Amino acid sequence: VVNITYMHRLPDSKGMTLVNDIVAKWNKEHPNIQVKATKFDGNASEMIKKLETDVKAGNAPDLAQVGYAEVPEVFTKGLLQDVTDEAAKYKDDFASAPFALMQVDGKTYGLPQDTGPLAYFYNAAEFEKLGITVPKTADELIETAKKTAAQGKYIMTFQPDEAMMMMSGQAGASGPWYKVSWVVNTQTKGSKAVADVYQQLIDNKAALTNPRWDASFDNSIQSGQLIGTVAAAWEAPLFIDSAGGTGAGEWKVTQLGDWFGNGTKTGSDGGSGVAVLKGSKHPAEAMEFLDWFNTQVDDLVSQGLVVAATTADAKTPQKWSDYFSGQDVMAEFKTANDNMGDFTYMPGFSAVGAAMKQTAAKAADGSAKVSDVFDTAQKTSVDTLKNLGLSVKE
Ligand SMILES: CC(=O)N[C@H]1[C@H](O[C@H]2[C@@H](O)[C@@H](CO)O[C@@H](O[C@H]3[C@H](O)[C@@H](O)[C@H](O)O[C@@H]3CO)[C@@H]2O)O[C@H](CO)[C@@H](O)[C@@H]1O[C@@H]1O[C@H](CO)[C@H](O)[C@H](O)[C@H]1O
Numbered sequence: 073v074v075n076i077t078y079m080h081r082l083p084d085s086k087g088m089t090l091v092n093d094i095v096a097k098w099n100k101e102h103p104n105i106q107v108k109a110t111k112f113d114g115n116a117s118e119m120i121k122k123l124e125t126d127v128k129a130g131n132a133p134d135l136a137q138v139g140y141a142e143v144p145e146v147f148t149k150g151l152l153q154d155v156t157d158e159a160a161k162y163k164d165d166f167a168s169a170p171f172a173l174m175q176v177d178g179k180t181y182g183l184p185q186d187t188g189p190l191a192y193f194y195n196a197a198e199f200e201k202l203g204i205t206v207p208k209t210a211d212e213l214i215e216t217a218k219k220t221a222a223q224g225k226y227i228m229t230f231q232p233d234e235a236m237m238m239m240s241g242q243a244g245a246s247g248p249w250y251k252v253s254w255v256v257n258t259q260t261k262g263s264k265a266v267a268d269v270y271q272q273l274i275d276n277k278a279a280l281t282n283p284r285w286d287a288s289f290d291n292s293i294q295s296g297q298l299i300g301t302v303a304a305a306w307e308a309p310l311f312i313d314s315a316g317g318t319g320a321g322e323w324k325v326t327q328l329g330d331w332f333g334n335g336t337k338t339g340s341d342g343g344s345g346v347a348v349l350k351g352s353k354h355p356a357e358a359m360e361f362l363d364w365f366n367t368q369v370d371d372l373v374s375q376g377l378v379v380a381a382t383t384a385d386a387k388t389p390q391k392w393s394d395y396f397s398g399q400d401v402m403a404e405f406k407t408a409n410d411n412m413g414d415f416t417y418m419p420g421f422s423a424v425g426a427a428m429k430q431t432a433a434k435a436a437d438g439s440a441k442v443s444d445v446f447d448t449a450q451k452t453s454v455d456t457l458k459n460l461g462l463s464v465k466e
Contacts, residue, residue, distance in 0.1 A: 073103065073104055073105075073106055075106050076105060076108070076357055076358050077108050077135070078107055078108070078109040078136070079109075079110050079112055080111060081116050081137050082375045083310065083376065085309065085375075087374075087391065089370070089375070094368055095107045098361055098365065102361070105361055107361050110133075117422060119137065120142050120422065123151055124149055134349065134352040134354060134355075135349070135352075137185070137344050138346070138347040140173040140340070140343050141340075141342070142344075142421075143173060143181070143347070144176070145421065145422060148420075150350060152176075152182075152349065152350065153181065153348040155355045156179050158348075158355055158356055158359035158360075159180035159183060159359065161363075165367050165381055166366070166380045167184070167382050169414075170345065171184050182345045182346050182348055183345055183362050185346055185366050185377065185379070185380055187378050188340055190242065190338045190412075191303060191326065191327060191338065191408045192300065192301070192328055193300065193301055193303045193307075193308075193325055194301075194324060194325075198225065199299070202223060204216050204220065204227075207227075207331070208329060208330065209329075209330065209331070210268075210331045213228070213269060214272045217273055217276070217278035218278050221276065221277060221278035225299045226279060226298055227300035228300060228301065228302070229282070229284070229298065229302070230436060231284040231289070231432075232429060232432035232433040232436045233285055233286070233429055235425070235432035235445055236422075236424065236425025236426075236428050237341035237342060239266060239432070239446065239449070240339065240340075240415070241338075242302065242328070243258075243262040244262065244340065245328060245334035245413050246261060246262035247261070248413075248414070248416055250418045250453070251416065255465045256454050258446050258447075259443075259446050262332055263443075264443070265331070265334075267442040267443040267445070270442045271435075271442045274436070274442065293316070294314075295318070304342055305376075305409070306377060308376055309389075320394065321395070321398075324396055324401075325399060325401040325405070326404060327404065327407065334413075337412070338408050346366065367384070369381055369384040369385075369386055373386045378408075378409055385406075386406065388400045388401050388402040388403070418456070419460060420456035420457065423456045424449050428448050428449050430448075454466050
C-alpha cells in the first residue's frame with residue numbers, strides 16, 4: 073500500500089462536504105493508494121512556514137496547498153518536487169491559466185485547484201430600498217457610498233488585514249506590479265486609482281475599515297450595517313455564515329465595477345494549487361489522487377472554490393442561491409475568473425503583504441494615506457528581492 077499525505081487549508085465549515093469525506097471516497101476505490109488529509113492547524117499565512125520547517129525535519133506531506141502567489145516563494149526555498157510528466161497526463165482536466173501558475177521555467181510542481189477573482193457582493197433589496205444602483209464609475213461609487221453612509225449603510229470596505237490581496241487585486245486588475253532581473257512598480261495607474269477611491273471613502277467615512285477576519289466584520293453584516301463589499305469569489309460561503317441570517321434572500325453578486333481604471337477586468341485574491349513537495353517518494357500516486365480530488369467539482373465548490381477543473385461546470389449550491397436572492401452566483405464567479413488580469417507575483421510576496429497590512433491599519437485610522445500602502449509595497453518588494461540576492465530595477 074502507498075500512503076499519501078495531503079495538507080490543505082480548506083475551510084471545512086459546517087454544512088460543507090468535508091475534505092476527509094471526499095478523501096474517504098478515493099480511499100474505498102483505491103486500496104493501494106491510501107490518502108490521509110489534514111487541515112493545517114493555523115492561520116493561512118503560517119502554512120508555508122510550517123511546510124518549510126516540515127521539509128527541513130522530514131515530516132512534510134506529499135501534497136500541500138500552495139497559493140499561486142506562494143508558488144514563487146516555495147519554489148525559491150527548494151520545497152517543490154518536479155512532477156512535469158505526471159501533470160502533463162492531467163493537464164487537459166484544468167483551465168490553462170491556473171495550470172500555468174503551478175509551473176516555474178517549464179516545469180510543473182502540482183495541479184491547480186481554484187481561482188480567486190474579485191467580485192462585488194451587495195444587498196440588492198437594500199439598494200432598491202435606498203433608491204441606488206450598483207455604481208458604474210468611480211465618481212458614482214463615491215457619491216452613492218456617501219448617500220448610503222448618510223443612512224448608516226456601507227457599500228465598501230477597506231480591510232487592513234487583507235491589504236496584500238485587496239490592494240494588489242483591485243490595483244492589479246489593470247496591470248502588473250512585477251515584470252521578470254525583476255522590474256518593480258507597485259505605483260501603477262491602478263494603484264493610484266485604488267488609493268484615490270479608498271482615500272475618498274475613508275475621508276468621507278463611507279467605507280467600513282473593520283479587519284475582514286475580526287468579529288467587527290461579522291457584526292457589520294449581521295447588524296445590516298454592511299450592504300456592499302468587494303470580495304474574493306471563495307468568500308461566498310464564509311460570508312453567508314458570517315451574516316448570521318441577515319440579508320438572506322436579499323444579496324447578489326456582480327462584477328468588480330470599472331472603479332479603478334480596470335474596465336471589465338478584475339484582480340486576483342488568493343486561489344491555490346496543490347504542490348508535490350521535496351521528499352515525496354510517490355509522486356505518480358500523489359498526482360493521480362490529486363487529479364481525482366481537484367476534479368470532484370461539486371465537493372470543492374461546497375468549500376467555496378471556483379474550481380480550476382474544466383471536467384464539469386461548477387453549479388451554485390442551493391444554500392448559496394437561497395442567500396443570494398436565488399442568483400446563480402457561481403456563473404458571476406466564472407465570468408469574473410474569465411476577466412481576471414494576469415498578475416505575476418515575486419518570491420517573498422508574503423513579506424510585502426505583511427508590511428502592507430501594518431501600513432493599511434494606519435491608513436484605516438488616518439495616521440497614514442492609502443497611497444502609503446502602495447509605497448510600503450514598493451519598498452518591501454525591492455528590499456525582499458535584494459535580500460534574496462535577486463537583481464532588481466525600480
Ligand atoms: C491569499 C490567501 O491565502 N488568503 C487566505 C486568507 O489569508 C489571509 C488571512 O489569514 C489574514 C488573517 O489576518 O492574514 C493574511 O496574512 C497576513 C497576516 O495577517 C500578517 O500577520 C502577516 O504578517 O502577513 C500576512 C500576509 O503575508 C492572510 O493572507 O485567509 C482566509 C481565511 O482563512 C483564507 O480563506 C484565504 O485563502 C483562501 O482560502 C480559500 C478557501 O476558503 C481557497 O483555498 C483560496 O484559494 C485561498 O486563497
